PDB file of C-alpha atoms in Angstrom:
ATOM      1  CA  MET N   1     105.843  86.993  84.105  1.00 10.64           C
ATOM      2  CA  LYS N   2     102.856  89.065  82.847  1.00 16.03           C
ATOM      3  CA  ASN N   3     102.304  92.545  81.602  1.00 12.88           C
ATOM      4  CA  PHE N   4     106.104  92.933  81.499  1.00 16.18           C
ATOM      5  CA  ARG N   5     107.936  95.783  79.796  1.00 15.10           C
ATOM      6  CA  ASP N   6     110.948  97.927  79.681  1.00 13.77           C
ATOM      7  CA  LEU N   7     110.152 101.544  79.853  1.00 16.34           C
ATOM      8  CA  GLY N   8     113.261 102.150  77.613  1.00 19.11           C
ATOM      9  CA  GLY N   9     112.749 103.309  74.144  1.00 16.58           C
ATOM     10  CA  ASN N  10     110.190 105.878  74.928  1.00 14.89           C
ATOM     11  CA  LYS N  11     110.782 109.329  73.409  1.00 16.20           C
ATOM     12  CA  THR N  12     110.980 112.565  75.418  1.00 19.01           C
ATOM     13  CA  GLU N  13     109.839 115.996  74.610  1.00 16.21           C
ATOM     14  CA  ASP N  14     113.477 117.396  74.356  1.00 18.47           C
ATOM     15  CA  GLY N  15     114.228 114.779  71.563  1.00 18.59           C
ATOM     16  CA  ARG N  16     115.976 112.128  73.483  1.00 20.76           C
ATOM     17  CA  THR N  17     115.116 108.449  74.198  1.00 20.13           C
ATOM     18  CA  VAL N  18     114.945 106.720  77.493  1.00 16.81           C
ATOM     19  CA  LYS N  19     117.827 104.306  77.946  1.00 15.64           C
ATOM     20  CA  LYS N  20     116.928 100.462  77.876  1.00 20.03           C
ATOM     21  CA  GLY N  21     117.620  98.280  80.822  1.00 21.08           C
ATOM     22  CA  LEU N  22     116.893 100.742  83.698  1.00 22.51           C
ATOM     23  CA  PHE N  23     113.212 100.702  84.558  1.00 25.89           C
ATOM     24  CA  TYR N  24     110.862  97.969  84.064  1.00 24.56           C
ATOM     25  CA  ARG N  25     107.229  97.222  85.036  1.00 24.70           C
ATOM     26  CA  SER N  26     105.231  94.038  85.353  1.00 23.60           C
ATOM     27  CA  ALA N  27     102.373  92.313  87.114  1.00 25.12           C
ATOM     28  CA  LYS N  28     102.858  90.234  90.273  1.00 24.83           C
ATOM     29  CA  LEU N  29     106.004  88.107  90.649  1.00 24.22           C
ATOM     30  CA  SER N  30     104.607  85.061  92.581  1.00 27.33           C
ATOM     31  CA  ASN N  31     105.248  81.615  91.482  1.00 28.08           C
ATOM     32  CA  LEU N  32     108.122  82.555  89.109  1.00 28.56           C
ATOM     33  CA  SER N  33     109.660  79.584  87.213  1.00 29.88           C
ATOM     34  CA  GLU N  34     113.376  78.934  87.521  1.00 33.57           C
ATOM     35  CA  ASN N  35     113.560  80.316  83.832  1.00 33.67           C
ATOM     36  CA  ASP N  36     111.677  83.540  84.876  1.00 34.23           C
ATOM     37  CA  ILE N  37     114.324  83.963  87.702  1.00 32.74           C
ATOM     38  CA  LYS N  38     117.096  83.496  85.186  1.00 36.26           C
ATOM     39  CA  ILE N  39     115.567  86.200  83.065  1.00 37.51           C
ATOM     40  CA  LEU N  40     115.520  88.709  85.881  1.00 39.61           C
ATOM     41  CA  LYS N  41     118.971  87.935  87.029  1.00 41.41           C
ATOM     42  CA  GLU N  42     120.207  88.370  83.425  1.00 43.14           C
ATOM     43  CA  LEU N  43     118.748  91.771  83.396  1.00 41.95           C
ATOM     44  CA  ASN N  44     120.952  92.687  86.498  1.00 44.37           C
ATOM     45  CA  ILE N  45     117.809  94.017  88.456  1.00 46.52           C
ATOM     46  CA  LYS N  46     118.709  95.101  91.737  1.00 46.97           C
ATOM     47  CA  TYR N  47     115.443  96.175  93.363  1.00 47.78           C
ATOM     48  CA  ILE N  48     111.860  94.880  92.962  1.00 47.31           C
ATOM     49  CA  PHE N  49     109.444  97.565  93.955  1.00 46.74           C
ATOM     50  CA  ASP N  50     105.952  96.229  95.121  1.00 44.95           C
ATOM     51  CA  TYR N  51     103.006  98.557  95.604  1.00 45.04           C
ATOM     52  CA  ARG N  52     100.593  96.064  97.140  1.00 46.95           C
ATOM     53  CA  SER N  53      98.801  96.008 100.341  1.00 49.49           C
ATOM     54  CA  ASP N  54      99.714  93.749 103.203  1.00 47.98           C
ATOM     55  CA  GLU N  55      96.982  91.308 102.651  1.00 48.90           C
ATOM     56  CA  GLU N  56      97.648  91.221  98.961  1.00 46.13           C
ATOM     57  CA  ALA N  57     101.343  90.323  99.713  1.00 43.96           C
ATOM     58  CA  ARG N  58     100.305  87.866 102.250  1.00 44.20           C
ATOM     59  CA  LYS N  59      98.054  85.967  99.669  1.00 47.47           C
ATOM     60  CA  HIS N  60     100.498  86.074  96.854  1.00 50.06           C
ATOM     61  CA  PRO N  61     104.159  86.461  98.245  1.00 51.60           C
ATOM     62  CA  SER N  62     106.643  87.216  95.617  1.00 47.82           C
ATOM     63  CA  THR N  63     109.128  84.594  94.734  1.00 50.97           C
ATOM     64  CA  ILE N  64     112.553  85.016  96.359  1.00 52.05           C
ATOM     65  CA  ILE N  65     115.483  85.733  94.064  1.00 49.07           C
ATOM     66  CA  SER N  66     119.074  85.681  95.250  1.00 51.61           C
ATOM     67  CA  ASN N  67     120.873  88.993  94.899  1.00 49.49           C
ATOM     68  CA  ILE N  68     117.562  90.919  94.204  1.00 48.01           C
ATOM     69  CA  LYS N  69     116.128  92.961  97.089  1.00 46.54           C
ATOM     70  CA  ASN N  70     112.394  93.353  97.474  1.00 46.73           C
ATOM     71  CA  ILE N  71     110.892  96.701  98.711  1.00 50.26           C
ATOM     72  CA  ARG N  72     107.172  96.933  99.351  1.00 49.38           C
ATOM     73  CA  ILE N  73     105.270 100.068 100.449  1.00 51.54           C
ATOM     74  CA  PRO N  74     101.534 100.076  99.927  1.00 51.49           C
ATOM     75  CA  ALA N  75     100.503 102.628  97.472  1.00 51.37           C
ATOM     76  CA  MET N  76      96.906 102.672  98.611  1.00 51.28           C
ATOM     77  CA  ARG N  77      95.389 102.684 102.091  1.00 51.07           C
ATOM     78  CA  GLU N  78      94.123  99.383 103.415  1.00 52.49           C
ATOM     79  CA  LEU N  79      91.392  99.130 106.014  1.00 52.27           C
ATOM     80  CA  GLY N  80      83.764  92.004  96.299  1.00 52.37           C
ATOM     81  CA  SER N  81      83.534  89.377  93.561  1.00 52.39           C
ATOM     82  CA  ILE N  82      84.448  90.278  89.975  1.00 53.16           C
ATOM     83  CA  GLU N  83      80.844  89.241  89.537  1.00 53.82           C
ATOM     84  CA  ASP N  84      79.785  92.058  91.783  1.00 54.37           C
ATOM     85  CA  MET N  85      82.000  94.540  89.891  1.00 55.08           C
ATOM     86  CA  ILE N  86      80.308  93.553  86.527  1.00 60.01           C
ATOM     87  CA  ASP N  87      76.616  94.084  87.206  1.00 62.05           C
ATOM     88  CA  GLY N  88      77.004  97.423  88.994  1.00 62.59           C
ATOM     89  CA  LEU N  89      79.854  98.489  86.698  1.00 60.59           C
ATOM     90  CA  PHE N  90      78.439 101.821  85.537  1.00 53.70           C
ATOM     91  CA  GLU N  91      76.320 102.758  88.556  1.00 54.37           C
ATOM     92  CA  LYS N  92      76.990 105.523  90.824  1.00 51.19           C
ATOM     93  CA  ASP N  93      78.922 103.410  93.299  1.00 53.65           C
ATOM     94  CA  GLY N  94      79.996 100.806  90.693  1.00 56.08           C
ATOM     95  CA  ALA N  95      83.546  99.595  89.736  1.00 52.59           C
ATOM     96  CA  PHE N  96      84.253 102.184  87.032  1.00 53.13           C
ATOM     97  CA  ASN N  97      83.486 105.244  89.274  1.00 50.46           C
ATOM     98  CA  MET N  98      85.421 103.543  92.274  1.00 50.89           C
ATOM     99  CA  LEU N  99      88.598 102.688  90.066  1.00 51.51           C
ATOM    100  CA  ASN N 100      88.394 106.249  88.860  1.00 54.61           C
ATOM    101  CA  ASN N 101      88.357 107.579  92.429  1.00 59.27           C
ATOM    102  CA  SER N 102      91.331 105.599  93.298  1.00 60.80           C
ATOM    103  CA  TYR N 103      93.330 107.134  90.545  1.00 59.66           C
ATOM    104  CA  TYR N 104      92.319 110.521  91.919  1.00 56.24           C
ATOM    105  CA  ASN N 105      94.068 109.799  95.079  1.00 55.19           C
ATOM    106  CA  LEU N 106      97.075 107.875  93.818  1.00 53.88           C
ATOM    107  CA  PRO N 107      99.419 110.786  92.821  1.00 49.36           C
ATOM    108  CA  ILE N 108      99.422 113.060  95.874  1.00 47.04           C
ATOM    109  CA  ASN N 109     101.175 112.414  99.135  1.00 51.11           C
ATOM    110  CA  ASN N 110     101.896 108.867  98.233  1.00 49.95           C
ATOM    111  CA  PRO N 111     104.571 107.201 100.420  1.00 49.98           C
ATOM    112  CA  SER N 112     105.014 104.446  97.901  1.00 52.08           C
ATOM    113  CA  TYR N 113     105.742 106.785  95.001  1.00 51.05           C
ATOM    114  CA  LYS N 114     107.986 109.095  97.129  1.00 49.25           C
ATOM    115  CA  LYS N 115     110.172 105.928  97.997  1.00 51.66           C
ATOM    116  CA  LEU N 116     110.148 104.824  94.315  1.00 54.41           C
ATOM    117  CA  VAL N 117     111.305 108.400  93.287  1.00 51.70           C
ATOM    118  CA  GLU N 118     114.049 108.272  95.989  1.00 50.58           C
ATOM    119  CA  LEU N 119     115.250 104.925  94.707  1.00 53.27           C
ATOM    120  CA  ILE N 120     115.455 106.029  91.228  1.00 53.55           C
ATOM    121  CA  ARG N 121     117.322 109.235  91.929  1.00 53.13           C
ATOM    122  CA  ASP N 122     120.571 107.373  92.275  1.00 52.03           C
ATOM    123  CA  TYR N 123     122.099 105.419  89.329  1.00 53.72           C
ATOM    124  CA  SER N 124     123.632 102.846  91.731  1.00 52.59           C
ATOM    125  CA  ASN N 125     120.177 101.492  92.623  1.00 52.63           C
ATOM    126  CA  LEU N 126     119.172 100.676  89.036  1.00 52.26           C
ATOM    127  CA  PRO N 127     117.894  98.485  87.277  1.00 48.92           C
ATOM    128  CA  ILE N 128     114.474  98.457  89.145  1.00 49.09           C
ATOM    129  CA  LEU N 129     111.225  96.505  88.464  1.00 50.07           C
ATOM    130  CA  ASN N 130     108.032  98.083  89.829  1.00 48.48           C
ATOM    131  CA  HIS N 131     104.918  95.952  90.027  1.00 49.42           C
ATOM    132  CA  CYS N 132     101.457  95.493  91.649  1.00 47.09           C
ATOM    133  CA  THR N 133      98.811  92.777  91.207  1.00 46.29           C
ATOM    134  CA  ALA N 134      97.899  93.090  87.455  1.00 47.44           C
ATOM    135  CA  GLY N 135     100.840  95.735  86.865  1.00 46.61           C
ATOM    136  CA  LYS N 136      98.106  98.190  85.465  1.00 44.16           C
ATOM    137  CA  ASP N 137      96.807 100.732  88.127  1.00 44.40           C
ATOM    138  CA  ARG N 138      99.127 101.373  90.989  1.00 43.09           C
ATOM    139  CA  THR N 139     102.028 100.352  88.485  1.00 45.44           C
ATOM    140  CA  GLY N 140     100.391 102.560  85.959  1.00 46.68           C
ATOM    141  CA  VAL N 141     100.683 105.790  88.001  1.00 47.46           C
ATOM    142  CA  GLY N 142     104.143 104.909  89.286  1.00 51.04           C
ATOM    143  CA  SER N 143     105.388 104.301  85.863  1.00 50.27           C
ATOM    144  CA  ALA N 144     103.798 107.409  84.625  1.00 49.18           C
ATOM    145  CA  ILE N 145     105.608 109.310  87.393  1.00 47.69           C
ATOM    146  CA  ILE N 146     108.992 107.840  86.187  1.00 44.99           C
ATOM    147  CA  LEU N 147     108.236 108.860  82.748  1.00 48.02           C
ATOM    148  CA  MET N 148     107.149 112.396  83.765  1.00 46.16           C
ATOM    149  CA  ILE N 149     110.594 112.772  85.510  1.00 43.50           C
ATOM    150  CA  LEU N 150     112.261 111.631  82.302  1.00 43.11           C
ATOM    151  CA  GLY N 151     110.335 114.120  80.123  1.00 41.54           C
ATOM    152  CA  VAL N 152     107.972 111.834  78.228  1.00 42.47           C
ATOM    153  CA  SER N 153     104.793 113.629  76.922  1.00 41.09           C
ATOM    154  CA  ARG N 154     101.366 112.839  78.383  1.00 40.93           C
ATOM    155  CA  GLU N 155     100.449 111.396  75.040  1.00 40.88           C
ATOM    156  CA  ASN N 156     103.286 108.810  75.253  1.00 41.92           C
ATOM    157  CA  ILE N 157     102.679 108.210  78.922  1.00 41.95           C
ATOM    158  CA  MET N 158      99.088 107.333  77.893  1.00 42.50           C
ATOM    159  CA  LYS N 159     100.344 104.968  75.280  1.00 39.66           C
ATOM    160  CA  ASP N 160     102.623 103.046  77.649  1.00 39.55           C
ATOM    161  CA  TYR N 161      99.797 103.042  80.242  1.00 39.20           C
ATOM    162  CA  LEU N 162      97.285 101.386  77.543  1.00 36.66           C
ATOM    163  CA  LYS N 163      99.674  98.674  76.710  1.00 38.35           C
ATOM    164  CA  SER N 164      98.423  96.743  79.889  1.00 38.58           C
ATOM    165  CA  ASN N 165      95.381  96.066  77.776  1.00 35.19           C
ATOM    166  CA  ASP N 166      97.148  93.152  75.948  1.00 36.05           C
ATOM    167  CA  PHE N 167      97.490  91.329  79.276  1.00 36.97           C
ATOM    168  CA  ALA N 168      93.840  92.487  79.930  1.00 38.70           C
ATOM    169  CA  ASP N 169      92.676  90.630  76.782  1.00 37.26           C
ATOM    170  CA  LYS N 170      94.246  87.288  78.039  1.00 36.60           C
ATOM    171  CA  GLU N 171      92.875  87.942  81.623  1.00 38.10           C
ATOM    172  CA  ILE N 172      89.351  88.433  80.162  1.00 36.90           C
ATOM    173  CA  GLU N 173      89.537  85.163  78.284  1.00 31.82           C
ATOM    174  CA  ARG N 174      90.621  83.574  81.415  1.00 27.06           C
ATOM    175  CA  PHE N 175      87.863  84.853  83.531  1.00 27.95           C
ATOM    176  CA  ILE N 176      85.340  83.895  80.945  1.00 25.52           C
ATOM    177  CA  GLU N 177      86.555  80.290  81.152  1.00 25.16           C
ATOM    178  CA  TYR N 178      85.939  80.436  84.951  1.00 22.59           C
ATOM    179  CA  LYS N 179      82.429  82.068  84.684  1.00 21.49           C
ATOM    180  CA  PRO N 180      80.962  81.217  81.366  1.00 18.29           C
ATOM    181  CA  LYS N 181      77.751  83.038  82.276  1.00 15.64           C
ATOM    182  CA  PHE N 182      79.614  86.230  81.388  1.00 17.32           C
ATOM    183  CA  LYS N 183      80.513  85.012  77.896  1.00 18.83           C
ATOM    184  CA  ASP N 184      78.220  87.547  76.269  1.00 20.51           C
ATOM    185  CA  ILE N 185      79.186  90.502  78.367  1.00 18.88           C
ATOM    186  CA  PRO N 186      80.830  93.139  76.005  1.00 17.07           C
ATOM    187  CA  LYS N 187      84.438  92.495  76.039  1.00 16.04           C
ATOM    188  CA  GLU N 188      85.270  96.150  76.353  1.00 16.96           C
ATOM    189  CA  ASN N 189      83.009  96.328  79.311  1.00 17.05           C
ATOM    190  CA  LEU N 190      85.123  93.590  81.023  1.00 17.20           C
ATOM    191  CA  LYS N 191      88.276  95.578  80.043  1.00 17.92           C
ATOM    192  CA  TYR N 192      87.141  98.271  82.538  1.00 19.61           C
ATOM    193  CA  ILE N 193      87.730  95.729  85.293  1.00 19.94           C
ATOM    194  CA  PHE N 194      90.610  93.599  83.880  1.00 21.00           C
ATOM    195  CA  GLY N 195      92.332  96.332  81.818  1.00 19.68           C
ATOM    196  CA  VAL N 196      92.670 100.223  81.697  1.00 19.63           C
ATOM    197  CA  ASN N 197      90.857 103.131  80.021  1.00 20.06           C
ATOM    198  CA  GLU N 198      91.968 106.752  79.204  1.00 21.20           C
ATOM    199  CA  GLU N 199      89.693 108.119  81.759  1.00 22.62           C
ATOM    200  CA  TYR N 200      91.374 106.378  84.741  1.00 21.05           C
ATOM    201  CA  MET N 201      94.788 107.964  83.957  1.00 22.07           C
ATOM    202  CA  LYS N 202      93.053 111.269  82.823  1.00 24.29           C
ATOM    203  CA  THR N 203      91.759 111.333  86.567  1.00 24.82           C
ATOM    204  CA  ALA N 204      95.283 110.961  87.986  1.00 25.72           C
ATOM    205  CA  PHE N 205      96.384 113.755  85.505  1.00 26.74           C
ATOM    206  CA  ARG N 206      93.382 115.962  86.601  1.00 28.45           C
ATOM    207  CA  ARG N 207      94.428 115.489  90.352  1.00 29.75           C
ATOM    208  CA  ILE N 208      97.980 116.711  89.386  1.00 28.17           C
ATOM    209  CA  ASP N 209      96.656 119.669  87.413  1.00 27.84           C
ATOM    210  CA  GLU N 210      94.237 120.830  90.242  1.00 30.04           C
ATOM    211  CA  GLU N 211      97.122 120.805  92.713  1.00 29.45           C
ATOM    212  CA  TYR N 212      99.963 122.094  90.565  1.00 26.76           C
ATOM    213  CA  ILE N 213     100.430 124.629  87.808  1.00 27.01           C
ATOM    214  CA  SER N 214     102.657 122.163  85.860  1.00 24.82           C
ATOM    215  CA  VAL N 215     104.293 118.736  85.937  1.00 26.25           C
ATOM    216  CA  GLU N 216     107.550 120.354  87.148  1.00 28.25           C
ATOM    217  CA  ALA N 217     105.759 121.987  90.009  1.00 28.57           C
ATOM    218  CA  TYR N 218     104.171 118.683  90.627  1.00 31.08           C
ATOM    219  CA  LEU N 219     107.518 116.878  90.883  1.00 31.74           C
ATOM    220  CA  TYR N 220     109.107 119.643  93.089  1.00 32.56           C
ATOM    221  CA  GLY N 221     106.185 119.694  95.522  1.00 32.15           C
ATOM    222  CA  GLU N 222     105.677 115.948  95.790  1.00 33.26           C
ATOM    223  CA  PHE N 223     109.345 114.680  95.467  1.00 33.32           C
ATOM    224  CA  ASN N 224     111.574 117.688  96.002  1.00 32.01           C
ATOM    225  CA  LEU N 225     112.838 117.405  92.486  1.00 30.74           C
ATOM    226  CA  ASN N 226     113.912 120.889  91.529  1.00 29.57           C
ATOM    227  CA  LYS N 227     114.934 121.679  87.939  1.00 27.95           C
ATOM    228  CA  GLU N 228     118.645 120.964  88.050  1.00 24.48           C
ATOM    229  CA  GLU N 229     118.018 117.685  89.778  1.00 25.36           C
ATOM    230  CA  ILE N 230     115.665 116.778  86.970  1.00 26.26           C
ATOM    231  CA  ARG N 231     118.229 117.971  84.344  1.00 27.30           C
ATOM    232  CA  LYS N 232     120.972 115.681  85.919  1.00 28.07           C
ATOM    233  CA  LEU N 233     118.650 112.601  86.055  1.00 29.13           C
ATOM    234  CA  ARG N 234     117.699 113.024  82.423  1.00 28.21           C
ATOM    235  CA  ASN N 235     121.396 113.379  81.325  1.00 27.22           C
ATOM    236  CA  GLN N 236     122.058 110.105  83.123  1.00 28.59           C
ATOM    237  CA  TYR N 237     118.986 108.044  81.949  1.00 24.75           C
ATOM    238  CA  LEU N 238     118.438 109.399  78.381  1.00 24.79           C
ATOM    239  CA  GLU N 239     120.309 108.856  75.188  1.00 22.93           C
TER     240      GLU N 239
END
């Protein structure tokens, strides 16, 4: 179980803290050990929410856990090598620009995030775990939206988002073992592929700010979360 964390402990702008044990995020949950399963059961997780595409899920199906229900809704539309991403990385159509463009599309009219928000609107559905492949991009924006609902600042959303780079560092070392010819590529260049960067999340924020005058307007327009409903959720989920 990789890139795994509880969103609890994050501070909100009104001074409270997110309760522990309600909202988790991770990378994919294929080939879980019996002990990984014990962990998730001990956390009393009720739903695992999966952002991956049909083909991603077919190639890496999630391990079955008794008493935990899996919900998968692709957060991106579905119609090369990591090596292909590396050499064109910063070109006009390269991987940095393409990943940036994906973040531009993620926050608006997203059927996956709409279902995620519907789930977390009712305390009886919690705890939940949300994940994608690496737990950094689709999971990054989905977890950011949960934190927006809870009232966490953009600065602290960014801090949680960038925590994915610890896993990225491990994944970079694993990749260089697979392809030693890239052993001298700057590691922070490989981090644009295997990890995350402030510009990606800033692009998601930029899309929100172009469409809506405030985060509150965004949550109301996209998820029908009016102010009193946000107040109620914060009173339930913050301490």
